[PDB]
């Protein structure tokens, strides 16, 4: 039977799916990625489904592939599932039609997520389910973690019996990711509800060569329409079947459901129709308001498709006088959203009462649907009756939003503690929170709920948690506003963020901070806070967790201490049980490396409880008063949009703050200066050999090489030390390494690679640096970058360029950013970047912060993320546009030469025409022309004057990682590359799907441990390089920064210049590869990757074939046995060793054998006399000819597919034989 | 001006599309295959569009690839088109959201065709247009070969001015493939209806390294909902 | 029970042969990405591609399998790019049986490939 | 001949194209069973996914 | 399994309208391309030749190992293996670790071995 | 006494214009849809027209 469990909606549903499934074809997509991974770990742990078998999970190349795999399985008799969201779901639409079309019991669990329109979103809403509204799948929505378990069960059983597939969805993140104490079911119970007669029939109806049948047939108009209506009886029965099962499950659970369910007053006059998690919060308000005499209600929709009107009505009170239908989506241009549209058709089709239906929209993209907003939905029903409104936003442009009053009271049940925790990434706060929930929920019989707000910044990002405990079930599917206990685990927050917003009177508040004395405390906390702490009469507790942690031996790790404060001061448990329960867990978890650790944790709990006393404060706080703004210049935009968002006030921005098409300006990153590195490399002038490897290596542009001639260094700081410039060309200048100690992640990469024995760069805590190195940076910042002094694309000269991509919200020591920065240090001013989704787009474009910037001249990388599946074909689009627009310019210029245009004008014009595709001459000439046609506005000459942003050749880049290039986007990568046109694709190889969870990609190595490769991948790496090298006309090269920066630059220069396609795959490090010694060891690692033979560097350049030379060049030397010492250094490879030695020793040998073979094959290619020649292109010329001209026999068929406008002329359909057979025949009758 | 012509709905519309387009990313799917092929033979015969240039047609690996190519082109400043039907259309749905999402003057001509459920069908119906009902594209239907020419014209001009993409559809085979005596228009006349201030703006709003901007951004819950409603005035 | 269960799974007793049929337009173009994945999956399936060197069924449109200089739709002046080498392309995996055939040339070799591939 | 060798026990996941058009245009279906009632289990998923479809059956 | 090319090429191409139309209508371009195709098949077959004769080559195992056992790439790792992003958040995630903001191991130590107190 | 409203611009669906084409004497009106959405309570065109009629309130 039943089992208590405290988890999220995802695992709540993956519980049921694993039980009811025999096969799962899968693909990772946030927020639904978990489900598939758990389905997989469980299977890997021998877990049995209801038939006593472990699940067959396989990972596809995309979710369309997964959709098709799911289709073939069902067809073939197995019961199947899949987990998906937003775009993933859209890709499964074509199959879904086939799947329900052929009446198969498929079941899709989707964590309803928003669709990428003006912007992308991982958050929750119904834009994707509503997109599959017509595929024929049944839809059943759960509105709470408990409901995800049940509803998933209902969906499986009903599918088996009805033969109509089911899509079970719950809101993304707000349910998928909400921990909550629920009651699950044993597989045996699920097994017991299965219609066996139906299941045994699914088996016989299936494909099998023993008793075959053909499905999928192409039908004409005579029978299509009929065969389409032939499934009606089924859709007629799918509702009762759902009702039957909601009933059976309720029989075992006690939790009862209806197709549509009413909640609220029997004589409510104002009813609301909602679907998804809004219902919980709406219900919660309903209670509050109703206790006060209000006649309000709610119909929570369960079974959205089929839409049984009969049941709709059976849930709507007869007194409903006004009813508003809430939709979590926006169909641009429809006369209303889906739910609203459906309800209406019921009301008209009913032909009686007509309550005045109002339509409203909420929660798009995980926007909050708090109580105040519901109060607002309601107040509207009785007041203004604004139709087609929005709630949650201030719509000042169209004016469709409802006003919201936050003074609205708290509506959580009586006896409910609400908590919030503010922490830094990787301080264990969230972990501790999830722990305190298992602990409380498992040793008390209170309901526990937990929701965690995160950060888009990968390193040092903030994180706020919302926990809730109470004697009553928690229906609050919204963030906590009236906090009982607010805790702040990173002292830096106090100053910057609104930590105490909404805290209840006398609400305890703990702060991790060393300001133990009223003195220091007074010299840090802002006015607003002291005051807040005061008038609200808070119980302020300050605790120096860092020190107590260091003291008790836990090396300054505050988690267990700040965990103590919760248990002790939180108010959820009585002191003795709290501190009891906590210790019991210290042993269960832990009990790892013996007692020492354990005890050292216990002691932390002790002193934590001991040092945890009320900070007593002066009444003065009641009117502590205001501070001064040591604020820098920041833009008109940073000031107005990017700062407000970064300080957690983006909800406050009305719609007028944003651009209709959702664009964003570059360089907003410049003004961020997060300053979160612990240690920042500090310069040592007397050791610097002046080389520029440090900046060239900094994955965030934290190091800035200054070369300034002496009179620029005048008002320079006392301490702005600079050496004399080594170099011929470099003589009148002084060179200095400027550390931006506020845009550093303290990864340690630069110092680690810094060449001299007596290092030039040394790691020092940020506070020993910042005071002195801040002003210096600024100074060094408003000094000219010497772009022309040294060869642009020379390691040293490259670091003397404007880096057009700085301070990305990417991990410290990320392996992607060093590459892409220098790519812009070489082509920045004229490049198009079509970025495939992944860390590239996440670090490269997470609103509001944008790394990429323009140069001194206002030009920089035109950046845009289309989707994940199509980065290349997107960048091929731009390429085509440039052709046409640039061709127009050339026919126009070619025409101007035939005019009475100036001689100079004509001289620029043919020079340009002659150098159109030269990124030097095209600009040299376009500029002469830009000045020459200045002002020109009439005819031809004016036209050309206006096409000035087309004069200089642009560089079209396609950015993406291994998951895109090798998997989902390969097919396209391949096509664009085969197209032979001039685009440049740069693949950052992390050897796994990073951005989403380190899922194994087709690029992942033999034996590497990733998701869905949990026992170490048991297949070789996909050889993309050798794969595209077969074309012969595509420049292909591989690189590794740590090994050769010279060779990287030689590839950038060569790839971009080959008049045609270029593939560039670079070894990129990642938190996911798990570098044992740190990401500072990253460069050293890329470098070992090439030495070991693991990653050889080569180049295949067809222009060499053009000159009769072999285009294949190896650049790395043979393997040097480093292999194992290389693999055993990454956790990805070492975990398998720890946990599967017998299997692991085998695979690292496989990988050591593979790199040995590939490199021996890389050897005689370099030496091959045989090879594929080259021509850029050159011929065609005006002329079209159909393959059908002057053909003797028919070249087309009687099929309607081949019929063309000018087709129909007679010919020999080959029914009478071969020519010679026709003739030997004529020459055999003649007469 | 006007010109009598006796042809089908397909070429009736491919007439207008070639005239109003600078780029076409393409893929063959019955019954709409013709359009793309004519767009291509014509281009191969030096035929000029309203800007006096021949069309840039390229064939993709699938129509999703074509959808994405159509997206990158528009983003990059060129006016673009594509021809598609049933499944081809379904594959263009993800992009279509991005295309209208970013307010680009795309135009999709679809010979409305049935979707493959219990069986496949090359024949005509609105199962595929209705599938793209929510992508944000404007939809304009023509109900006769004469109407395919006009309505295709309307769809192009209106797109240029409104910045809301357009999907112009006509029934597959019953219009796409019906020969009928119609009156067409000269490119010069089509050219004469174009809002130039709007067209010159499409050009400036576009991607270009000379004056860059970032599009496609990932947004959280604080600003997604708003930025989504920001396009209302347009619709 | 048990014995009865097994008695009912009689359409599963003998090993079945899973074939994937399609021409050049599917294998080289639209369906390649998938063809590649399934093939890289290393599981036991058999793909048979009928190469017509163009998209036949719909109008003889040029495919990525169409040869240098062959006249098809969108290759109206004869394709100006080489044939996509799918065979050498998938032969890079190392664990995928790859063969090409031609009936008119050797029917013996065709049968030797059918027997070996399956 | 592919069926003359494996017919009795094969699954066919046919990508769209002439294969499916000639192999499955209702009402006429070429593929037949043998003297024993067994033959190729035939099915066209779509055009874009023949392989991943036949991988489904395999699973 | 096939033998080297035997100059049939052109008499082969010129036999299919697909190739012959281009000739009729674009001789200057067509004579060029049938030479391209005649050169290509000549190269590919010469490459097909020393593959047959290669001592170097990619070995084989049908499969055979695994056996019950699951392990996350994150076990016993020293530094953080996941980020603060909502995309990486998992059910059992949230335990503290080194987010690499403080440098390399040896940089952390040379530092500890430089203040100690 | 029969009529027909041919729809041109299906999206956006301007109700205002819908009505400006429907005679005031229409006593019964059937919306023809060239599609089948299995399980919906009606097809798109029909669904749209309805919302106009209710939203009109007369
Ligand atoms: C169509 C689609 N399916 C799934 C996803 C989820 N997603 C985005 S990031 C990711 C993987 C990223 O891959 P990779 O190229 O390896 O990126 P990186 O390692 O550089 O982060 C996926 C599957 C998506 N965005 N779109
Ligand atoms: C998603 C999708 N896009 C387009 C089509 C139109 N269509 C079917 S047949 C055809 C080409 C057939 O290709 P190929 O594999 O060469 O087939 P064969 O030469 O054997 O006829 C296409 C594009 C389709 N069925 N599905
Ligand atoms: S530690 Fe890392 S982020 Fe900091 S300056 Fe060095 S390379 Fe840059
Ligand atoms: S790596 Fe070291 S020696 Fe080289 S420029 Fe940087 S600080 Fe100087
Ligand atoms: S590629 Fe890896 S190291 Fe870089 S941002 Fe992504 S998760 Fe971080
Ligand atoms: Ca290039
Ligand atoms: Ca096989």
| Known catalytic membership, residue A1158 | no
Kindly report the CATH number assigned to the domain that includes residue A760.
3.30.70.20
CA atoms in the 13 A half-sphere facing the CB of A652: 11
Q: Are A661 and A675 found together in one domain? A: no
Contacts with C5 (C-beta within 8 Å, 6 or more apart), sequence order:
none
Distance CA A437, CA A1176 (A): 65
Contact A695, A704 (CB under 8 A): yes
Report helix angle A1141-1166 to A1131-1139, nearest 10: 140
In the 8-state DSSP scheme, what is residue A900? T
Q: Whose CA is nearest to atom 10 of ligand 2?
A: D17
**Looking at the structure, do residues A202 and A58 belong to the same domain, yes or no?**
yes
Q: How far apart are CA B53 and CA B55, in angstroms?
A: 6
Contacts of D50 in chain B (CB under 8 A): none
Domain match, A917 and A937 both: yes
Chains contacting D with at least 3 CB pairs below 8 Å?
A, B, C
Is A68 in contact with C32 (Cβ distance < 8 A)? no
Residues A744/A681, Cβ–Cβ less than 8 Å: yes
Residues on chain F touching B143 (C-beta within 8 angstroms): 6
Indicate if A1023 and A1108 belong to the same structural domain. yes
Contact A201, A173 (CB under 8 A): no
Would you say the CB of residue A703 lies under 6 angstroms from ligand 3? yes
Q: Which two tokens stand for residue A681?
A: 């490399």
Contact between A1144 and A1137 under an 8 Å Cβ cutoff? The reply is yes
CA-A817 nearest atom, ligand 5: 4
* Tokens linked to A620: 């003065």
With a 6 Å cutoff on the Cβ, whether A748 touches ligand 3 is: yes
Q: What's the A430 CA to ligand 5 centre distance in angstroms?
A: 21
The answer to whether A55 touches A22, Cβ cutoff 8 Å, is yes
Q: Of the bound ligands, which one is closest to the alpha carbon of residue A809?
A: 5
Burial of B189 (C-beta count, 10 Å sphere; 0-12/13-18/19+): middle
Ranges assigned E (strand) in chain B: 3-7, 23-26, 56-59, 80-84, 107-112, 119-120, 138-141, 166-171, 180-184, 214-218
Is residue A887 left, alpha or beta, with left meaning phi > 0 and alpha meaning psi from -120 to 50? Answer: alpha
Per the structure, how many domains does chain B have? 1
A214 DSSP 8-state letter: E
- For residue A799, give the CATH number of its domain: 3.40.50.970
| Tokens representing residue A748 in the block | 């340690």
d(CA A652, CA A647) in angstroms, rounded, equals 11
Cβ neighbourhood burial of A581 (10 Å; 0-12, 13-18, 19+): middle
Q: Are strands A3-7 and A179-184 parallel, antiparallel or unpaired?
A: antiparallel
Q: Which of C74, C78, C84 to mutate to test the interface with B (most CBs of B within 10 A)?
A: C74
CA D28, D30, D36, D42 dihedral sign is negative
From A489, A486, A491, A426, select the one nearest A461 (Cα to Cα): A426
For residue C25, say whether it is annotated as part of any ligand binding site: yes
Contacts by A548-554, CB closer than 8 A, 24 or more apart: A548/A604, A548/A607, A548/A608, A548/A611, A549/A604, A551/A607, A552/A600, A552/A603, A552/A604, A552/A607, A553/A600, A553/A603, A554/A600, A554/A601, A554/A604
Whether residues A1114 and A1192 share a domain: the answer is no
C67 secondary structure, DSSP code: P
- CA E67 to chain C, closest CA, distance in angstroms equals 17
- Give the Cα separation of A889 and A912 in Å (integer): 10
The nearest CA of chain D is from the CA of B130 a distance in Å of: 20
Question: Which residues on neighbouring strands pair with residue A326, listed in sequence order?
Answer: A360
Strands (E), C34-103: 46-50
> Do A112 and A175 have their domain in common?
yes
Method used to solve the structure? X-ray
Scanning E46-75 for CB atoms below 8 A from A yields 46-47, 50, 54, 56-59, 63, 65-75
Cα distance between residue E51 and residue A160, in whole Å: 53
DSSP, collapsed to helix, strand or coil, labels residue A323 as strand
Q: What is the CATH number of the domain that holds E112?
A: 4.10.790.10
CA A942 to CA A923: how far, in whole Å?
19
Report how far residue A829's alpha carbon sits from residue E57's, in angstroms, rounded to the nearest whole number.
45
Set of chain A residues whose Cβ sits within 8 Å of the Cβ of E37: none
Tell me the pairing of strands A138-141 and B180-184. unpaired
Task: Answer whether B110's CB lies under 8 Å from B166's CB.
Answer: no
- For tokens 């290596």, the residue is A697
Minimal Cα–Cα distance from E11 to chain A, Å? Answer: 16
What are residue E102's phi and psi, to 5 degrees? -100, 15
Dist. CA A622–CA A371, nearest whole Å = 31
Give φ, ψ of A195 to 5 degrees: -70, 110
**Residue A815 to residue A824: CA distance in whole angstroms:** 16
Query: With contact defined as beta carbons under 8 Å apart, do A111 and A126 qualify?
Result: no
User: How does A378-394 read in b/e, with b if 16+ C-beta sit within 10 Å?
Assistant: bbbbeeeebbebbbbbb
Phi-psi region at A1016: left, alpha or beta (left = phi > 0; alpha = psi -120 to 50): left
Longest C-alpha distance within chain A, in Å?
127
Query: Which of the listed residues A414, A433, A451 is the one where a domain comes to its end?
Result: A414
Number of H helices, E strands in chain E: 4, 0
Residue A685: asked if its preceding bond is cis (omega within 30°), the reply is no
Q: Does A771 touch chain F (CB under 8 A)?
A: no
Segment (H or E) for A1039: strand A1035-1039
- How buried is residue A406: exposed, middle or buried, by Cβ count under 10 Å (0-12/13-18/19+)? exposed
Chain A positions touching C93 (Cβ under 8 A) are 1020, 1022-1023
Q: How far is the CA of B56 from the centre of ligand 6 (A)?
A: 20
Task: Check residue A656 and report its DSSP letter.
Answer: G
- Distance, in Å, from the CA atom of D37 to the CA atom of A17, rounded to the nearest integer, reads 36
Phi, psi angle pair for A905, to nearest 5°: -55, -50
- For residue A196, what are the domain limits? 1-257
**Structure tokens belonging to residue A979:** 């197209």
- Residue A927 CA to residue A288 CA, distance in Å, equals 70
Task: Provide the token pair at A1008.
Answer: 């590497």
Mutation probe of ligand 4 site: the residue of A754, A756, A757 with most atoms within 8 A of C-beta: A754
Burial category of A51 from C-beta neighbours within 10 Å (exposed 0-12, middle 13-18, buried 19 and up): middle
| In A746-891, beta strands by DSSP E | 761-765, 831-835, 862-864
Q: How far lies A605's CA from each of A426, A436, A601, in Å? A: 20, 14, 7
Q: Are residues A231 and A278 in the same domain?
A: no
Contacts for A616 with CB less than 8 Å, ≥ 6 apart = none
What's the gap in Å between B29 CA and the centre of ligand 2? 7
Taking CA–CA distances from A454, the nearest residue in chain B reads: B220
E30–C67 C-beta distance less than 8 A: no
User: Do E73 and A998 form a contact (C-beta atoms < 8 A)?
Assistant: yes
Annotated ligand binding at B30? The verdict is: yes
* Contact assessment for residue A151 and residue A395, using Cβ atoms and an 8 Å cutoff: no
**Is A962 a pocket residue for ligand 1 (Cβ < 6 Å)?**
yes
Binary contact (C80, A1180; C-beta < 8 A): yes
Both structure tokens of B234: 């347009």
Specify whether A804 is located in the same domain as A886: yes
CA distance A636 to A624: 31
CB contacts of A1011 in chain E (<8 Å) are 73
Strand partners, A510: A487, A541
Instruction: Looking at the CA of residue A689, tell me the nearest atom of ligand 4.
Output: 3
Alpha helices in A743-838 (DSSP H): 749-753, 766-781, 795-798, 817-827
Helices (H), A230-337: 232-253, 278-291, 309-313
Same domain, A713 and A862: no
Q: What is the DSSP string of A341-409?
A: HHHHHHHHHHTS----EEEEE--GGG----HHHHHHHHHHHHTT--SSEESSS---SS--BPP--TTPP
DSSP A830: G
A1087 is catalytic: no
Sign of the Cα pseudo-torsion (A983, A988, A993, A997, in order): negative
* Alpha carbon of A969 to ligand 1 centroid (Å): 10
| Start-to-end C-alpha separation, chain C | 35
- Do A1046 and A795 touch, CB atoms closer than 8 A? yes
Say yes or no: A889 and A770 in one domain.
Answer: no
Nearest CA to ligand 4 atom 2: A754
The terminus-to-terminus CA distance of chain B in angstroms comes to: 32
C-beta atoms of B62 and D44 within 8 A: no
| Ligand 2 contact via C23 beta carbon (within 6 Å) | yes
């Amino acid at each position: 039977g039943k089992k208590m469990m405290t988890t999220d909606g995802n695992t709540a549903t993956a519980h049921v799916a694993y039980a009811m499934s025999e096969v799962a074809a899968i693909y990772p997509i946030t927020p639904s990625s978990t489900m598939g991974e758990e389905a997989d770990d469980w299977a890997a742990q021998g877990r049995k489904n209801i038939f006593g078998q472990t699940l067959t999970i396989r990972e596809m190349q995309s979710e369309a592939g997964a959709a098709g795999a799911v289709h073939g399985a069902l067809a073939a008799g197995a019961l199947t599932t899949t987990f998906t969201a937003s775009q993933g779901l859209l890709l499964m639409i074509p199959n879904m039609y086939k799947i329900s079309g052929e009446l198969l019991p498929g079941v899709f669990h989707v964590t309803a997520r928003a669709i990428a329109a003006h912007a992308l979103s991982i958050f929750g809403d119904h834009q994707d389910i509503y997109a599959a509204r017509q595929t024929g799948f049944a839809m059943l929505a759960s509105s709470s973690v408990q409901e995800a378990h049940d509803m998933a069960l209902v969906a499986h059983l009903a599918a088996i019996e009805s033969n109509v597939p089911f899509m079970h969805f719950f809101d993304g993140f707000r349910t998928s990711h909400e921990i909550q104490k629920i009651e699950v079911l044993d597989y045996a119970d699920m097994a017991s509800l299965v219609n066996q007669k139906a299941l045994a029939e699914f088996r016989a109806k299936s494909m099998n060569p023993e008793h075959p049948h053909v499905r999928g047939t192409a039908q004409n108009p005579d029978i299509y329409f009929q065969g389409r209506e032939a499934a009606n009886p089924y859709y007629l029965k799918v509702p009762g079947i759902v009702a039957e099962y909601m009933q059976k499950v309720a029989s075992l659970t006690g939790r009862s459901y209806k197709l549509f369910d009413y909640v609220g007053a029997p004589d409510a006059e104002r009813v609301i129709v909602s679907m998804g998690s809004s219902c919980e919060t709406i219900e919660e308000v309903i209670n509050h308001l109703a206790a006060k005499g209000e006649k309000i209600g709610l119909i929570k929709v369960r079974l959205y498709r089929p839409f049984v009107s009969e049941a709709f009505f059976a849930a709507l009170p007869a007194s409903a006088k006004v009813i508003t239908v809430l939709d979590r989506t926006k169909e641009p241009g429809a006369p209303g959203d889906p739910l609203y549209l459906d309800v209406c058709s019921a009301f008209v089709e009913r032909g009686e009462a007509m309550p005045k239906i109002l339509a409203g929209r909420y929660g798009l993209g995980s926007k909050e649907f708090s109580p105040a907003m519901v109060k607002s939905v309601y107040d509207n029903m009785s007041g203004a009756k604004k139709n087609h409104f929005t709630v949650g936003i201030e719509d000042d442009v169209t004016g469709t939003s409802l006003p919201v009053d936050n003074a609205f009271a708290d509506t959580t049940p009586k006896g409910t503690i609400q908590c919030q925790f503010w922490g830094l990434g990787a301080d264990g706060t969230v972990g501790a929170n999830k722990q305190a929930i298992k602990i409380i929920g498992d040793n008390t019989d209170l309901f526990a709920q937990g929701y965690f707000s995160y950060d888009s910044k990968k390193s040092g990002g903030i994180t706020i948690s919302h926990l809730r405990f109470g004697e009553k079930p928690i229906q609050s599917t919204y963030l906590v506003n009236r906090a009982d206990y607010v805790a702040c685990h990173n002292p830096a927050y106090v100053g910057i963020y609104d930590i105490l917003e909404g805290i209840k009177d006398g609400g305890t508040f703990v702060l991790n901070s060393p300001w133990s004395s009223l003195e220091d405390m007074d010299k840090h906390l802002p006015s607003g806070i002291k005051r807040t702490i005061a008038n609200k009469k808070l119980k302020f507790y300050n605790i120096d967790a860092v020190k107590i942690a260091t003291d008790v031996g836990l090396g300054g790790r505050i988690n267990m201490i700040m965990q103590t404060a919760f248990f002790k001061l939180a108010g959820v448990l009585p002191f003795e049980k709290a501190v009891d329960l906590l210790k019991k867990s210290i042993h269960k978890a832990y009990g790892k490396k013996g007692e020492k650790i354990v005890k050292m944790n216990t002691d932390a709990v002790d002193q934590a409880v001991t040092s945890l006393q009320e900070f007593k404060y002066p009444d003065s706080w009641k009117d502590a008063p205001a501070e001064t703004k040591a604020e820098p210049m920041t833009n008109e935009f940073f000031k107005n949009v990017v700062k407000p968002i970064l300080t957690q006030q983006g909800d406050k921005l009305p719609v007028s703050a944003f651009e209709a098409d959702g664009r964003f300006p570059l360089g907003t990153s410049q003004f961020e200066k997060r300053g979160v590195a612990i240690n920042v490399p500090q310069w040592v002038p007397e050791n610097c050999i002046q080389c520029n490897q440090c900046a060239f290596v900094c994955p965030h542009s934290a190091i800035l090489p200054v070369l300034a001639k002496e009179e620029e260094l005048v008002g320079a700081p006392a301490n702005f030390t600079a050496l004399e410039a080594k170099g011929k060309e470099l003589k009148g200048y002084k060179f200095r390494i400027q550390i931006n100690t506020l845009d550093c992640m303290g990864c340690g990469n630069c110092a680690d690679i810094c060449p001299p024995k007596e290092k030039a760069l040394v790691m020092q805590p940020l506070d020993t640096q910042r005071d002195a190195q801040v002003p210096n940076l600024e100074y060094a910042a408003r000094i000219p970058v010497k772009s022309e002094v040294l060869p642009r694309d020379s390691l040293k000269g490259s670091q003397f360029q404007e880096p057009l991509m700085e301070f990305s919200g990417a991990c410290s020591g990320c392996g992607e950013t060093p590459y892409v920065r220098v790519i812009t240090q070489l082509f920045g001013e004229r490049m198009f970047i079509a970025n495939a989704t992944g860390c590239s787009s996440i670090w490269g474009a997470s609103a509001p912060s944008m790394p990429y910037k323009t140069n001194r001249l206002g030009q920089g990388p035109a950046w845009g993320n289309s989707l994940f599946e199509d980065a290349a074909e997107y960048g091929f689009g731009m390429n085509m546009s440039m052709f046409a627009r640039r061709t127009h310019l050339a026919d126009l210029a070619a025409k101007a030469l035939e005019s009475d245009a100036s001689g100079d004008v004509k001289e620029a014009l043919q020079g340009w025409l002659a150098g159109k595709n030269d990124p030097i001459k095209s600009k040299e000439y376009g500029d002469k022309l830009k000045k020459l046609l200045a002002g020109q506005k009439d005819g031809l000459l004016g036209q050309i004057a206006a096409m000035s942003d087309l004069y200089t050749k642009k560089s079209v880049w396609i950015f993406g990682g291994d998951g895109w290039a090798y998997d989902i986007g390969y097919g396209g990568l391949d096509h664009v590359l085969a197209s032979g046109e001039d685009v440049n694709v740069f693949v950052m190889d992390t050897e796994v799907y990073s951005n989403t969870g380190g899922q194994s990609s087709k690029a992942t190595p033999t034996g590497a441990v990733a998701k869905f490769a949990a026992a170490g991948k048991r297949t070789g790496k996909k050889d993309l390089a050798r794969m595209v090298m077969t074309y012969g006309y595509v420049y292909v090269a591989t690189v590794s920064m740590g090994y050769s920066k010279q060779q990287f630059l030689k590839v950038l220069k060569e790839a971009e210049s080959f008049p045609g396609p270029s593939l560039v795959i670079a070894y990129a490090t990642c938190i996911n590869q798990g570098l044992r010694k740190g990401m500072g060891k990253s460069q050293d690692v890329m470098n070992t990757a090439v030495k070991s033979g693991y990653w050889p560097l080569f180049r295949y350049d067809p222009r060499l074939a053009a000159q009769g030379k072999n285009p294949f060049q190896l650049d790395s030397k043979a393997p040097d046995g480093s292999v194992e010492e290389f693999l055993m250094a990454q956790n990805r490879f070492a975990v398998l060793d720890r946990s599967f030695p017998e299997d692991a020793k085998r695979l690292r040998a496989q990988v050591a054998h593979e790199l040995d073979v590939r490199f021996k094959e890389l050897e005689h290619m370099a030496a091959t006399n045989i090879f594929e020649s080259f021509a850029p292109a050159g011929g065609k010329a005006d002329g079209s000819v159909d393959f059908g001209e002057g053909a003797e026999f028919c070249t087309r068929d009687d099929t309607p597919m081949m019929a063309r406008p000018d087709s129909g002329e007679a010919c020999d359909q080959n029914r009478a034989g071969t020519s010679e057979q026709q003739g030997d025949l004529s020459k055999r009758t003649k007469k």
